[PDB]
Design an enzyme around this catalytic site. Structure first.
Site, PDB file in Angstrom:
ATOM      1  N   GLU A  33       0.826  -1.207   0.000  1.00 56.74           N
ATOM      2  CA  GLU A  33       0.000   0.000   0.000  1.00 56.74           C
ATOM      3  C   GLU A  33       0.856   1.251   0.000  1.00 56.74           C
ATOM      4  OE1 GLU A  33      -1.126  -0.676   4.486  1.00 56.74           O
ATOM      5  OE2 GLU A  33      -2.779   0.504   3.621  1.00 56.74           O
ATOM      6  N   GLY A  34       0.288   2.327  -0.516  1.00 55.52           N
ATOM      7  CA  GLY A  34       0.955   3.618  -0.603  1.00 55.52           C
ATOM      8  C   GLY A  34       0.061   4.672  -1.220  1.00 55.52           C
ATOM      9  N   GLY A  35       0.667   5.748  -1.711  1.00 55.99           N
ATOM     10  CA  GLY A  35      -0.068   6.836  -2.343  1.00 55.99           C
ATOM     11  C   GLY A  35      -0.709   6.448  -3.660  1.00 55.99           C
ATOM     12  N   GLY A  37      -2.050   3.562  -4.504  1.00 54.99           N
ATOM     13  CA  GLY A  37      -3.232   2.761  -4.241  1.00 54.99           C
ATOM     14  C   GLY A  37      -2.870   1.579  -3.358  1.00 54.99           C
ATOM     15  N   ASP A 144      11.550   7.064  -8.218  1.00 58.40           N
ATOM     16  CA  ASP A 144      11.200   6.516  -6.911  1.00 58.40           C
ATOM     17  C   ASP A 144      11.894   5.189  -6.626  1.00 58.40           C
ATOM     18  OD1 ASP A 144      10.110   6.762  -4.363  1.00 58.40           O
ATOM     19  OD2 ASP A 144       8.017   6.315  -4.988  1.00 58.40           O
ATOM     20  N   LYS A 146      13.728   2.674  -4.544  1.00 60.50           N
ATOM     21  CA  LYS A 146      13.762   2.359  -3.125  1.00 60.50           C
ATOM     22  C   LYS A 146      13.566   0.862  -2.946  1.00 60.50           C
ATOM     23  CE  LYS A 146       8.953   3.743  -2.221  1.00 60.50           C
ATOM     24  NZ  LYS A 146       8.180   4.734  -1.452  1.00 60.50           N
ATOM     25  N   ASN A 149      10.294  -0.746  -3.825  1.00 60.16           N
ATOM     26  CA  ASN A 149      10.038  -0.836  -5.254  1.00 60.16           C
ATOM     27  C   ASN A 149      10.988  -1.789  -5.990  1.00 60.16           C
ATOM     28  OD1 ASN A 149       7.811   0.845  -5.009  1.00 60.16           O
ATOM     29  ND2 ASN A 149       8.888   2.672  -5.686  1.00 60.16           N
ATOM     30  N   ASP A 162       6.669  -0.056  -9.695  1.00 59.72           N
ATOM     31  CA  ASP A 162       6.048   1.245  -9.507  1.00 59.72           C
ATOM     32  C   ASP A 162       6.610   2.322 -10.406  1.00 59.72           C
ATOM     33  OD1 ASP A 162       5.110   3.387  -6.668  1.00 59.72           O
ATOM     34  OD2 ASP A 162       4.008   2.845  -8.491  1.00 59.72           O
TER      35      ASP A 162
HETATM   36  C1  LIG Z   1       3.324  -0.733  -6.350  1.00 60.60           C
HETATM   37  C2  LIG Z   1       3.393  -1.703  -7.469  1.00 60.60           C
HETATM   38  C3  LIG Z   1       3.432  -3.062  -7.197  1.00 60.60           C
HETATM   39  C4  LIG Z   1       3.502  -3.949  -8.270  1.00 60.60           C
HETATM   40  C5  LIG Z   1       3.516  -5.358  -7.999  1.00 60.60           C
HETATM   41  N1  LIG Z   1       3.498  -5.931  -6.825  1.00 60.60           N
HETATM   42  C6  LIG Z   1       3.546  -7.278  -7.103  1.00 60.60           C
HETATM   43  C7  LIG Z   1       3.580  -8.298  -6.082  1.00 60.60           C
HETATM   44  O1  LIG Z   1       3.414  -9.495  -6.270  1.00 60.60           O
HETATM   45  N2  LIG Z   1       3.870  -7.727  -4.883  1.00 60.60           N
HETATM   46  C8  LIG Z   1       4.012  -8.403  -3.694  1.00 60.60           C
HETATM   47  C9  LIG Z   1       3.802  -9.722  -3.362  1.00 60.60           C
HETATM   48  N3  LIG Z   1       4.113  -9.780  -2.037  1.00 60.60           N
HETATM   49  C10 LIG Z   1       4.023 -10.907  -1.105  1.00 60.60           C
HETATM   50  C11 LIG Z   1       4.230 -12.324  -1.658  1.00 60.60           C
HETATM   51  C12 LIG Z   1       4.340 -13.255  -0.442  1.00 60.60           C
HETATM   52  O2  LIG Z   1       3.155 -13.132   0.354  1.00 60.60           O
HETATM   53  C13 LIG Z   1       2.868 -11.834   0.896  1.00 60.60           C
HETATM   54  C14 LIG Z   1       2.760 -10.806  -0.234  1.00 60.60           C
HETATM   55  N4  LIG Z   1       4.484  -8.606  -1.497  1.00 60.60           N
HETATM   56  C15 LIG Z   1       4.421  -7.757  -2.522  1.00 60.60           C
HETATM   57  C16 LIG Z   1       4.738  -6.362  -2.411  1.00 60.60           C
HETATM   58  N5  LIG Z   1       5.369  -6.029  -1.247  1.00 60.60           N
HETATM   59  O3  LIG Z   1       4.445  -5.565  -3.286  1.00 60.60           O
HETATM   60  C17 LIG Z   1       3.597  -7.460  -8.460  1.00 60.60           C
HETATM   61  O4  LIG Z   1       3.564  -6.230  -9.042  1.00 60.60           O
HETATM   62  C18 LIG Z   1       3.530  -3.454  -9.568  1.00 60.60           C
HETATM   63  C19 LIG Z   1       3.473  -2.074  -9.739  1.00 60.60           C
HETATM   64  N6  LIG Z   1       3.399  -1.189  -8.721  1.00 60.60           N
END
Ligand SMILES: Cc1cc(-c2nc(C(=O)Nc3cn(C4CCOCC4)nc3C(N)=O)co2)ccn1
Length: 286
Positions: A33-35, A37, A144, A146, A149, A162
């Site tokens: 989560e963040g700004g 969405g 961004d 970090k 990301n 992101d």
């Molecule tokens: C902001 C953003 C995110 C994305 C994106 N996020 C994923 C993804 O799969 N993210 C995650 C998956 N798990 C865990 C996996 C293990 O179980 C707990 C969640 N954490 C995360 C996480 N911390 O973002 C794929 O694309 C794309 C564009 N902008």
């Protein structure tokens, strides 16, 4: 898969348990989560996916821009966009699921995961630098960079994520994350040299296991340890993450030297991403 899919809002609502905001550990679907969405875990076409629900016409333009940037930026070290949804109540973006979450969560061992070895951290640093190199070769400034990301797939391959603030120069709308920002970026400049500075903060997080900012810490900002080490008040050895058993002084000092060069106050004195890539390769070279 060879195509971007248009998803219905109701399909995304259904596969995320009606966008369940509880964390996955307690039985929910929230992953981040963040700004921008909220990112939710979903299940579409017998595959796990990540669904970002965007949080009116200005938001639709940022949604269209995100689709445009992701369609042009396909690389092994960038998160892959699978599809989108705009027919219903909210705008959604669907991505490839990253089973090992973010580098920030793996560095803090969130949800009981084992600490990352020094060997895996070196591979992740190299992977992340390969992703930034692709963006800079294709004239994109991330804005961004970090550890939140930098996402990790089933093999811990680093995937830059992101691209909501990405730009293909001065600005009056200063965006980014303060604890990772270069001085010129905090003043409104738009340059790929600022991404290099932010990557240097990420390298310090990798070495130390410490977050970039911690209110219950001295110094509060991680980038300030560079001055403590330069003034000989502390050594890099004092800051090495104690949750590793395989770090060696030579390779840790080689990564710290790259991080120190990235964190140069003058943007033109920083190495470019190709040089960062070369230095990170020499660190593990045989
Ligand atoms: C902001 C953003 C995110 C994305 C994106 N996020 C994923 C993804 O799969 N993210 C995650 C998956 N798990 C865990 C996996 C293990 O179980 C707990 C969640 N954490 C995360 C996480 N911390 O973002 C794929 O694309 C794309 C564009 N902008």
């Amino acid at each position: 898969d060879t195509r971007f899919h248009s998803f219905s809002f109701y399909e995304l609502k259904n596969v995320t348990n009606n966008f369940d905001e509880r964390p996955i550990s307690v039985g929910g679907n929230k992953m981040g989560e963040g700004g921008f969405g909220v990112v939710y875990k979903g299940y579409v076409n017998n595959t796990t996916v990540a669904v970002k629900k965007l949080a009116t016409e200005e938001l639709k333009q940022q949604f269209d821009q995100e689709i445009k940037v992701m369609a042009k930026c396909q690389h092994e070290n960038l998160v892959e966009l699978l599809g989108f949804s705009s027919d219903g109540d909210d705008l959604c973006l669907v991505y490839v699921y990253m089973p090992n979450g973010s580098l920030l969560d793996r560095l803090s061992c969130l949800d009981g995961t084992p600490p990352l070895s020094w060997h895996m951290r070196c591979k992740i640093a190299q992977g992340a630098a390969n992703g930034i190199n692709f963006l800079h070769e294709n004239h994109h400034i991330h804005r961004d960079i970090k550890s939140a990301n930098i996402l990790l797939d089933e093999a811990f391959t680093a995937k830059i994520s992101d691209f909501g603030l990405a730009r293909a120069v001065m600005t009056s709308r200063i965006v980014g994350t303060t604890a990772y920002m270069a001085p010129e970026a905090l003043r409104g400049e738009i340059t790929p040299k600022s991404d290099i500075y932010s990557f240097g903060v990420v390298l310090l997080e990798i070495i130390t296991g410490l977050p970039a900012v911690d209110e219950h810490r001295e110094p509060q900002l991680l980038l300030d340890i560079k001055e403590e080490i330069e003034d000989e008040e502390k050594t890099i050895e004092d800051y090495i993450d104690k949750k590793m058993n395989d770090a060696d002084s030579t390779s840790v000092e080689a990564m710290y030297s790259v991080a120190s060069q990235c964190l140069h106050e003058k943007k033109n004195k920083r190495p470019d991403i190709k040089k960062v890539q070369q230095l990170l390769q020499e660190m593990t070279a045989s």
